[model samples]
Target: GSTATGITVSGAQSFKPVAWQLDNDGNKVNVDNRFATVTLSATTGMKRGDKISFAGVKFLGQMAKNVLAQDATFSVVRVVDGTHVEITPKPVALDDVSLSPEQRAYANVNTSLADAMAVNILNV
Candidate 1:
């Protein structure tokens, strides 16, 4: 018996489960890490907002003891079928960057003008 989920986290974000190895059959797998990874070999069902946790000690002593944090949240965005599921991770925003030369030039002009006007403007 095999189960599949169609719900995918579609966006520019890091999948928490890194170091996944794919087999020729296309099953994504990874070693169970107690700190930040979990293995649900016998899980038949999951619900939205269900919190899963992993626990372990890190090299940093403090992080090891109190690190029973969430590895991932199981969310049922849509139910595909009785045996099948459409599970996906709740989206988390990652810091992103964009650049424009015009914006940078204007910022530099403001800096230059501030420097030039320092003698005229008194600091209160």
Candidate 2:
């Protein structure tokens, strides 16, 4: 089954979620502390306090774990052009682990911002 929710953004701009995720029980979950990303496209004239709102995002499990959980507030972080833009919450924290040589080399590559951002998009 699928679910739909309305997204409201102040300002004359159009946006859609390119990627989103729900839990195993088909409930909406925040994309914080968990690996997730939502890509917004066709954003035109977004400004401060121009919010995108949704309902039914309550936690269903232990409140202790949920206390440290972050809100998946998608804010306009950058604008590429008139018809394109990008929105996201703060970057996810990466754990300190052994880095492979290939990973190090890949990080050295001077990739474009769009490519870097696209690396984390969820695949359906």
Candidate 3:
């Protein structure tokens, strides 16, 4: 069975998870990845304080130890545009490890900004 909560609403915004890494402390980190890119299409009505995350990715490599873990959920720090935006809590990482060479996480988001457990959406 899938761990992610199913989308239940009029419509949903979608994102493709393009990156994942482990910070110095061995925690999962996903923030403003440069070489690797996140795909945020199928979006509308996004704003500051909205919760978000990438979904449906298999954790491998060093991250393989965390296959049981849920997607790394984050919040919209600021909405850059209708589709592009900043996210957090961005971990402190001047150093890290790439968990995947090529893989992607897919997700859907719905509901109010203040109430859903879904980061507003949830990521992995």
Off by over 4 Å in 2: 1-41, 53-72, 90-124
By TM-score rank, best first, the candidates go 3, 2, 1
Q: Between which residue pairs do clashes occur in model 3?
A: 51-119, 51-120, 52-119, 52-120, 53-122, 53-123, 54-123, 71-123, 72-123
lDDT of 2 by residue, 1-124 (tens): 1112233322322112112332222335433322112333333444432333222121223234656543233444454552344444322211112323323222211111222121111112
- Candidate 1 backbone overlaps, count: 0
Writing each residue's lDDT as its tens digit, candidate 1 over 34-119 gives 12111222223434333322111112223345465322233344323423233343222121112233223212111110111111
Q: Which candidate ranks first by TM-score, i.e. highest? A: 3
The digit string of per-residue lDDT tens for model 3 on 88-114 reads: 433221111222322222122221122
- Deviating ranges (above 4 Å) for candidate 3: 1-39, 57-68, 91-124
Residue 19 of model 2: what lDDT? 28
| Worst 10-residue lDDT window, candidate 2 | 115-124
Question: Better model by lDDT, 1 or 3?
Answer: 3
**In candidate 1, which residue pairs clash?**
none
- TM-scores for all candidates? 0.22, 0.24, 0.36
In model 3, state the lDDT of residue 2.
31
Error of 2 at 39 (Å): 5.2
Worst 10 residues of 3 by lDDT: 106-115
